[PDB]
Amino acid sequence: GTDSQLAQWASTRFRSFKRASTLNQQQATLKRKAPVDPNTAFYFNKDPIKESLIEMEAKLSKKAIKNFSEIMMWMGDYPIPKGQTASLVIQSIISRGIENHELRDEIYCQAYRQTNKNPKVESAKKGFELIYFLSITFSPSDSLLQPFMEQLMSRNIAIQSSSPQLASLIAVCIEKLESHPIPSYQQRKMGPSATEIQSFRSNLENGDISTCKIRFIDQSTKLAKINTYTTIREITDTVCRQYGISQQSIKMFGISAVNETAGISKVVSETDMIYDVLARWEQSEEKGEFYFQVRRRFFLDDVNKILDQEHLWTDDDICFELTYCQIRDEWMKGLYTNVNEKDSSIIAAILIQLLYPNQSKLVLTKEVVRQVLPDQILNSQNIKVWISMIESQIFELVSQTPEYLKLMFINLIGSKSPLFGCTLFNIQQKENPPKAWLAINKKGVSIFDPHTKESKNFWTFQSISNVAFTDDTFCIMTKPIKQTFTTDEHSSIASVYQFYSSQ
Numbered sequence: 001g002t003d004s005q006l007a008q009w010a011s012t013r014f015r016s017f018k019r020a021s022t023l024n025q026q027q028a029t030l031k032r033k034a035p036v037d038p039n040t041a042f043y044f045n046k047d048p049i050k051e052s053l054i055e056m057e058a059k060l061s062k063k064a065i066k067n068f069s070e071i072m073m074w075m076g077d078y079p080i081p082k083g084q085t086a087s088l089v090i091q092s093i094i095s096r097g098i099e100n101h102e103l104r105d106e107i108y109c110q111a112y113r114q115t116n117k118n119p120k121v122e123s124a125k126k127g128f129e130l131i132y133f134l135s136i137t138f139s140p141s142d143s144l145l146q147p148f149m150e151q152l153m154s155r156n157i158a159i160q161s162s163s164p165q166l167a168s169l170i171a172v173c174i175e176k177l178e179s180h181p182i183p184s185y186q187q188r189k190m191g192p193s194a195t196e197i198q199s200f201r202s203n204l205e206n207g208d209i210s211t212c213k214i215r216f217i218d219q220s221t222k223l224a225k226i227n228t229y230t231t232i233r234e235i236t237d238t239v240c241r242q243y244g245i246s247q248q249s250i251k252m253f254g255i256s257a258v259n260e261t262a263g264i265s266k267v268v269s270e271t272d273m274i275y276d277v278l279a280r281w282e283q284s285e286e287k288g289e290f291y292f293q294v295r296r297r298f299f300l301d302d303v304n305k306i307l308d309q310e311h312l313w314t315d316d317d318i319c320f321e322l323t324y325c326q327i328r329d330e331w332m333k334g335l336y337t338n339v340n341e342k343d344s345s346i347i348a349a350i351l352i353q354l355l356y357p358n359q360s361k362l363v364l365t366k367e368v369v370r371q372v373l374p375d376q377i378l379n380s381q382n383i384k385v386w387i388s389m390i391e392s393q394i395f396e397l398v399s400q401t402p403e404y405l406k407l408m409f410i411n412l413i414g415s416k417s418p419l420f421g422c423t424l425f426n427i428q429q430k431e432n433p434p435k436a437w438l439a440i441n442k443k444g445v446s447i448f449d450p451h452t453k454e455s456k457n458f459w460t461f462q463s464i465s466n467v468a469f470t471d472d473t474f475c476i477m478t479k480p481i482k483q484t485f486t487t488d489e490h491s492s493i494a495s496v497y498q499f500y501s502s503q
Contacts, residue, residue, distance in 0.1 A: 004147075004154065005146065005150045005151065006042075006147045006151040007042070009143065009144060009147040009148075010042070010109075013055065014053055014055070015041070015051065015053065015054070016036075016039075016040065016053075017038040017041075023035065041053055041113065043113065043116050043117045044114050044115070044116055044117050044119075044124075048065070048072060048078065049110075050065070051064075051065065052106055053109050053110060056102070063096060063103060064106050064110070067093060067096055067110065071093065071111055071127075071130065072114070073086075073089045074086060074089045074090050074093065075123045076120075076122070076126060077120075086194070087191075087192065087194040087197055087279075088282065088283075090130060090191050091190060091192070091282070091283070093130070094134065094137050095190075097137065097138055098137065104139075104140055105144045108131070108134060108140045108144065108148060112127070112131065112148070112151070114127045115128055115131075121166075125166060129197075129200070129201075132172055132176060135173050135176035135179075136176055136188060137187075137188050137191070139177070139180040140177075145177065145180070148177070149177050152170055152177075155170055156174065165204070165205075172204070186229045188229070188276060189273065189276045190279035190280060191279060192275065193275065193282050194282065195278050196275045196278060196279070199226070209225055210226045211223040211225060211226060212274060212292070213291070214239045214255070214292050214294060215258075216243060216293070216294050216322065217322060218322075222242045224242070226275075228275065229273060230273065231270065232254075232269060232270050232271070232272050233270035233271065235292075236250070236270065236294065239294055240294065243294070244318040245319050246318070248316070249316045249318075251298070252296055252298045252299075252300070252319070253294055254268070254297030255268045255292050255293065255294055255295070256268060256293050257277065257281070257291075258291050258292075259288050259289065259290045259291075260288060260289075261287050261288025261289070262286040262288050264286065265293075267297075267425070267489070267496070268492070269489075270495050271491060271495065272491065294322075296319070296322060296326055297496070298499055298500070299441070300503060303410065303414030303415065303420055303421060304415055306410055307411055310407060314407070324406040324409070327410055327413055327420075328351070332374050333374060334374035334375060334377065336417045336419075337376055337377065337453065338418065338419075338453060339377070339416050339417075342389070342393075343416060344373060345386070345389040345392070345393045346393050346412060347409065347413070348386070349397050350397070350408055351371075351409060352364075352372055352394065354402060354409070355372070356368075357402065359397075364387055366383050369383055369386050369390065370383075418448075418455060419448065419453060421441045422439040422446070423439070423440050423441070424437045424438070424439055425437065425438040425474075425487055425489050425492070426487070427474075428486035428487070429486065432456075433449050433451070436448065436449060437449075438474065438487065439455075440493070440496045441500065442500055443460060444459050444461045444464070444500075445458070445464065445497070446458045447485075457483075459478055459483070461500065463478055464476045464477065464478055465477045467494070469490035469493070469494060470490070471490070472486060472487070472488055473487065473490075474487050
């Protein structure tokens, strides 16, 4: 008999209900045909809408028109152009909803309308999937919230018996709208990736737990449990526990986004949402595939005292092993070059004793030298000269345990490299060099020339009263002198700076 809560809400807001009222108020004018019925605006149509459903400003209506065609693309009722995909389409819709706040009710109404009296069940379900992905991001207005929920509840009651799967999908939408207001630290910034989409689908279909693949430095992997709101800090904690890193060491670890084809290894902020990162990777124009890699991020102990404070490094033997493995890998990638040929030959000698514990049985070859010296160092002399220099250092090497050789290797690298234990961020400067490295470690903040690896500036944590961030800068307050660096990595920089300075 009486109109639904949604229809009552739409009566004073929808174009179709308003135009019919202005035809009822000033009824003196002659009508051409019967009134088309204002409720038809709530029903599916194969054609793209020519104006927004809700009466609003023409600037907002124009964006609502483009949004409608995108909803149609997501639902498979409008084709997707050459350089686009379904994940990219829904990311656009949610982005429009995030930044155009007054377009939110209109997004929810367009999605819902397209689920009501749709001739294809494989289009209406996608319409409800979109409602789910909107409900995890932003709330509809306080005015629309209850009437819209009551409508979903009615559609659930009407389809419970015939379609219990589609009913579970509507029930999750209702759960996610009931969850609002979402706390600030949990508010998602991106729409879903094709990964998040598939995980959501197979969890409703099969009930199986969603996981994310995380690599370690040894190239081994771990599957971490992932939810809508999982942060990078939470996944780092879980994979590290799975690997066997002790409770106290877990805080020293972090995650980097690694792309091998396009040489990128970028720190991932511990406060980012893992699903927001996955969406950002889809949006990247970089060639190749990205993957997450656990790395030891923080180094609080003095590398110069490692041989006399072994327990600080070896008590957690899993953490020690991952640490040794990480420094060895950086050495093999040529990251440590503040080393002369004698120092490199000593390093090569230790690393050979670690690969071949039987000192007497050693036959030194070109192939053995390549396992322990990076090309960057090897380039400086003929490999035959390296064999001879390494053979000489091996004569000065006494029998040692594998653990002690790993500590000796770290001590040598650590003592000779000013970048050891630093987290590096690419920064832009008007000073020389224009493209520099912001280095943050246990001592403070530095600026390093990437070419020479020479430190241009250094500020201890004691000498910095406060820090500040903008969307494109990092600022340190150092007597009042402000030092500013161009970078968009405020989130990762704040986490690294807070950790080290707070000690």
